[PDB]
Amino acid sequence: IPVTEDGIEYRWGNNPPVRLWAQLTTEGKPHGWPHEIILYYYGLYPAATIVAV
Amino acid sequence: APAVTNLECQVAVCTHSSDFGGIATLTFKTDKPGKCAVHSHSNVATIQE
Amino acid sequence: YEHTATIPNVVGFPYKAHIERNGFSPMTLQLEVLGTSLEPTLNLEYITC
DSSP, X not given: OOOOSSXXXXXXXXXXXXXXXXXXXXXXXXXXXHHHHHHHHHHSSSSSSTTTO | OOOOSSEEEEEEXXXXXXXXXXXXXXXXXXXXXXXXXXXXXXXXXXXXX | OOOOOOOOOOTTOOEEEEEOOTTSOOEEEEEXXXXXXXXXXXXXXXXXX
């Protein structure tokens, strides 16, 4: 299933509903050399960053 | 209890994005111990207390 | 929390491995190599006496 930053619900059998939504994660070091700022800003919000570069 | 005089802030850790990861420290010359309000005008962050 | 390290394959040599996952107190790992063994594969072609 795809999980976004808004929320996902469960109903599997008769179990009570379960609520999940994701972190911000993304890899790289956002406080280091120039070469990884781009990828950190890329993975987090995948779109609208190609426009920036 | 005006208790500001001069105010400076250090930041230790801000492991963020889940509930509360910013642990900040405040040091200042102060008057008698007591209750004082605290908030943040800027909405880029928030204060739990 | 996964983390990679390398140890010279030598017996009786303490090895240090520090962890730098922020948001917690940094700590270290003591690694000791004691009595490695290497067991080959045998086929037993023939015997004599």
